[PDB]
């Protein structure tokens, strides 16, 4: 890898600088280099990895949606414009799929070394998320298998989080939020999405009394995102 010659600590320092500069491609390359040093990631480092790739793939997904919408309109009384829209949508799609495939890092070897609930749930949620992004663009013979890979990753994360974390844990809440979105947007299961979001919200509500002021702010922030989705869906 191109980061093989840079110190782990220097990669982490530069990932933080890249975040401040809004250079998320650089940030992701730095964090990929840090992961490939082979050591486990701290909580802060896991967040740097997630922030970097979420921003990179977020831009790709936004562009894919714009191009897909144009492509769909061109396939209606529409005037033929040639293969260019499909070609360029395919180009963006392939790059997106490449980034999801890279986030490989989970399989080699972050997840197998993650033993604590906070690390293991974090990585399995990530695995669900990036299979979900692959599912968003999938149209072929593997679409069902991609969806099931997302589901399986989310389900293992959910099982661990329910056994090992309090209902207000922000990682547990963000996992439940995203698995609920998976049910709604990917799995054609709006009722499961709503049930999961509602039960997650209610159980967190009942546990807020145990929290410090700072933890209360952390948990209620994600609870509001659950409520926002429930408001949209009901």
């Amino acid at each position: 890898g191109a980061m093989g010659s840079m110190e782990r600590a220097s990669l982490i320092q530069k990932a933080k600088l890249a975040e401040q500069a809004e250079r998320y491609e650089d940030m992701a390359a730095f964090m990929k280099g840090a992961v490939e040093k082979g050591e486990e990631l701290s909580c802060e480092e896991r967040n740097l990895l997630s922030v970097a790739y979420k921003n990179v793939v977020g831009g790709q997904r936004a562009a894919w949606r714009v191009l897909s919408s144009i492509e769909q309109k061109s396939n209606e009384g529409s005037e033929e414009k040639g293969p260019e829209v499909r070609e360029y949508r395919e180009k963006v799609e392939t790059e997106l799929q490449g980034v999801c495939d890279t986030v490989g890092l989970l399989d080699s070897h972050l997840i197998k070394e993650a033993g604590d609930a906070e690390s293991r749930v974090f990585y399995l949620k990530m695995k669900g998320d990036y299979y979900r992004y692959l599912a968003e663009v999938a149209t072929g013979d593997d679409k069902k298998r991609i969806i099931d890979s997302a589901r399986s990753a989310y389900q293992e994360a959910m099982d661990i989080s329910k056994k090992e974390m309090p209902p207000t844990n922000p990682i547990r809440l963000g996992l439940a939020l995203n698995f609920s979105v998976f049910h709604y947007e990917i799995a054609n299961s709006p009722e499961e999405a709503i049930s999961l979001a509602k039960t997650t919200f209610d159980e967190a509500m009942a546990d807020l009394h145990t929290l410090s002021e700072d933890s209360y702010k952390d948990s209620t922030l994600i609870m509001q995102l659950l409520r926002d989705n429930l408001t949209l869906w009901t």
Binding site: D129, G174, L177, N178, Y184, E185, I222, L225, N229, L232
Partner: peptide, 5 residues
Amino acid sequence: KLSLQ
């Protein structure tokens, strides 16, 4: 927009 951002 719906997922954790």
